Amino acid sequence: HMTSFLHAYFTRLHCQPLGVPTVEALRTLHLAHNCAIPFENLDVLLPREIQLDETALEEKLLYARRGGYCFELNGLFERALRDIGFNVRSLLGRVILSHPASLPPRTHRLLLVDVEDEQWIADVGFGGQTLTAPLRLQAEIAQQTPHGEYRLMQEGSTWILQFRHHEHWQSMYCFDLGVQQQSDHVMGNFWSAHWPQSHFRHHLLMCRHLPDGGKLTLTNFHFTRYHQGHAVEQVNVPDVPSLYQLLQQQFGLGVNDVKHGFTEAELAAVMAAF
Amino acid sequence: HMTSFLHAYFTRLHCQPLGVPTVEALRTLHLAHNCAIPFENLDVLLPREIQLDETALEEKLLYARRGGYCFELNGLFERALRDIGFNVRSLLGRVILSHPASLPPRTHRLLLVDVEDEQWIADVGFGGQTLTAPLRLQAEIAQQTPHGEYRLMQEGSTWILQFRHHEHWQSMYCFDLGVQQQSDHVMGNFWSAHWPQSHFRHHLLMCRHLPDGGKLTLTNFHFTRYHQGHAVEQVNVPDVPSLYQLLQQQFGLGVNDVKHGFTEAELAAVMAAF
Amino acid sequence: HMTSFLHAYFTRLHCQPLGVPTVEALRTLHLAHNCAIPFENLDVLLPREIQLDETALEEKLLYARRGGYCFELNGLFERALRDIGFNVRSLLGRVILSHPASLPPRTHRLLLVDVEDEQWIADVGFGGQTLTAPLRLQAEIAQQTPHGEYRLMQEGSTWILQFRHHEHWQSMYCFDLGVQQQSDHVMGNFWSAHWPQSHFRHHLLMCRHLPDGGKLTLTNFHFTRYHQGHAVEQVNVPDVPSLYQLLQQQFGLGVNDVKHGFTEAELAAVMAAF
Amino acid sequence: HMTSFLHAYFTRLHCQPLGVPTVEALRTLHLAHNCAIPFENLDVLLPREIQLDETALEEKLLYARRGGYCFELNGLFERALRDIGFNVRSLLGRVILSHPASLPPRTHRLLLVDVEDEQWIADVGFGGQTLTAPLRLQAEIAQQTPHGEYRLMQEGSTWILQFRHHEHWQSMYCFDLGVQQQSDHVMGNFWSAHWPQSHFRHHLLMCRHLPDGGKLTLTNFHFTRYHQGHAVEQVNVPDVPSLYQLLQQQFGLGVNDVKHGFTEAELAAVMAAF
């Protein structure tokens, strides 16, 4: 089967329809998503509100060929998986990367999927180190992904997904299986986009995934390409115009669109702040 | 026993020390609190950040003789009950009064107390209809309080709070027993104080409790006195100055204080917005 | 002559082209504008940034059939008068209606037009009591307008404008002939839309003008119609849906539009804040 | 003569009273100020409103031993010069350093002083390159200052200002002699502290002046000392604690104070955003 939405979803993912909800279907859609729809925080910098209702998400991520973060990406992904027939619901977790003194709020959205009597967690909105393939809800089991090795962890009642890096695991974010509501994400988005100390307000962030363990990475003007998890080439874009171009070339950002588009002069004012 | 804090706490509550954590101790401290420390949202209107660390709370609610809401009030209360020896932790719930189309975020804080092998919920920061006495965690049981009658539903794991009104139970807000973290309150406060559509940014709100089922109520210039739950006297303050006075008289607001005080001209700019 | 813009301008004003810049041309375009493009502050309440570059103005006020305030309205009007050949530039003035203790900032934009060796001030963005016809820059001279009587008094190189209200004269606002720059308006808009105590953030405001001294007035749910300056009929809209309708009927608001439109659920969240 | 204010002003300036308003008095007070009261934007980063009424200025800049920027510094300075008997009023100008495409708003405050039948412009609030000694209102005349050579200029009613950079002249800000009102500064401060793209919201900025053409410079963790206009020593502070210390040592920031003080943990949250 294929709903109106599900249609342009597959269309944007440069992928072929799927009607049967199976671990393999997930496996691919995930990577598809990860390569098609970039991780971007540009609506936060050029001041511009982020709606999270399936429609705004549809018109932003699909039609306008734009990106987003936690809430937007997994919000769209959640819809797709649902229309395809899977059993999903979002979850909120705490970003603990920076290794904070005290647990932070529920800033990160992620998906919980029930496929073939097991429970997996799909997440395409974590940015740089996001997963690129579902993982099973189990501790220790060093799971594998097209772009890395991760390890969940049943600590009491809050799982602690962590990944392999430089000979040992790093915590990325903790969460629990508690239900969440649309508003809980709206609040999550509100925090992230408006709390003065939120990093998302202090630098442009883009990240797109490629087929063979490769990925792109923009952080203001610092562009970087990776292959099989290695830093191959690192360009430092020299100007706004040049960057405006890089956004459309490398990440395939829909710079035009009656609604969600944005002039190049706007990208200039945004980078000007830094 | 009595800690430095616990000291000025009792001092502000115009109450006598208590060292033994029992339902009765709770019973009274609750009402004490409800009558001494007013519910106020003034720091939200005159723009002015709300810290929630025990110290800012101490200096705002105790020393400066000021009020606050959910987060501040129950934040202070939680500390006290803790220092007195009780077993407490905060909980976040969703305000459903307005009977919203879809569940709202975790805007409200409240306390869970374990006294004599049972579980009670104390809450002094809900404002107008806050409880004025602990309640037992049980369904149907129409519980009684110095200022009203409440009933807790048991919809799943989550609970709902209600109170009588025209011979029919009315739900105030829902909530479950999930753990919360300081940050979760900071986020709650952030939402409440800064989300554009938050009602707290559109009108002054004050509310203080009196011994015999009475309470005071300000909503901008509309002042109201209540006895045994009845509207006895309703004055419509005519001017800023007059109101400035009313805040100190009726609610016992510490209008002066190196830090948390505020001029009367400031209150004027605040009410000027409306 | 007629530029691409000037085209849809006249089209929105349900008016016939004009190519000769004369006091009479001004006289009508002013009233035209005043009846076609409503005074609205809706983008301020549903959080949504207000661009002021001729293009955003064009797309919002003309194509989407929406309204605006000081900055937007006169901004569009200024362009028109310019393309028609007049001699115009904006001015910033201080809103003194509330009769403030100390002069407020330059919140209000207005136009200065040099027609037939004289200087006139056109202003369609003041809302409720805006002018509806150019006025001559001269003191005492009680000038006449389709919707009221005005007057100009002196106190420096700065100008004060008034209108006879209840039985006599009283100040509306002041300003001076100093040059302004786009950014100065951007700042003016930033203030008005974001300074916490700005009244525009605390209630919906709409106002549209009618041919024979009549006008429409919305303030949240309070709708009011006026004839020859008199309150004929005052309805108190009972619900969001009904109001959503009233916005399109009475004011002719373009509720749809890829970009500047807004759902009715959005208007509900906005009125929910109050 | 010496007013209550003027008293602690001199006390903070580690300077001896002056009662006669002369170019020489200005000459020194300026340098005095420039070395005593640092240029700081810390209240912008840890969210915290900036009042500009003489009293808040007094309590922040003098009693709490804290710094500020444009509005606060020159605001305090203006009061002093006034109480001492000079003839002063503030002016607003536009920061053109970055060499913007179009004129920016009136972000910068500065002083205009009438001493011995001439007109000078004093400004202690511009930060890094602020003046350190009055200048005469005259074009071309390459004027000299304890920390640099500034050439003023013309171009219509406006005046530009520059300093020898590299060796070519780099326009700084610009302005006109138009009157300004308190609100005009409040709006200016509003812009600077809240407009999302304002650089002041993206990094900590501190700058203090020293006696012999030397000055200190903090930009986040990049500390720098200068002598006779040369970069002697550049330390890159390694941690928040260490920086907290550097603020009190090198710039003499009053880190404590019932009101304007700030914990070290607060500084951490601020730097954490970057």
Curated annotation (Swiss-Prot), chains A, B, C, D:
GO molecular function: arylamine N-acetyltransferase activity; N-hydroxyarylamine O-acetyltransferase activity
Active site per the UniProt annotation: C70, H108, D123
Catalysed reactions listed for this entry: an arylamine + acetyl-CoA = an N-acetylarylamine + CoA; an N-hydroxyarylamine + acetyl-CoA = an N-acetoxyarylamine + CoA
EC class name: transferase
Domain of life: Bacteria
InterPro entries, sorted: Arylamine_N-AcTrfase (IPR001447), Papain-like_cys_pep_sf (IPR038765)
Pfam families, sorted: Acetyltransf_2 (PF00797)
Gene Ontology cellular-component terms listed: cytoplasm
SUPFAM superfamilies: Cysteine proteinases
Subcellular location: Cytoplasm
Regulation: Inhibited by N-ethylmaleimide and iodoacetamide.
E.C. code: 2.3.1.118, 2.3.1.5
This protein's UniProt keywords: Acyltransferase, Cytoplasm, Transferase
Gene3D superfamilies xrefs: 3.30.1120.150, 6.10.140.1930, Cysteine proteinases
Protein purpose: Catalyzes both the acetyl-CoA-dependent N-acetylation of aromatic amines and the O-acetylation of N-hydroxyarylamines. In vitro, catalyzes the O-acetylation of N-hydroxy-Glu-P-1, and the N-acetylation of isoniazid and 2-aminofluorene.
Family under the similarity heading: Belongs to the arylamine N-acetyltransferase family.
Quaternary context: Monomer and homodimer.
Protein name as it appears in the record: Arylamine N-acetyltransferase / N-hydroxyarylamine O-acetyltransferase
Name of the gene: nhoA
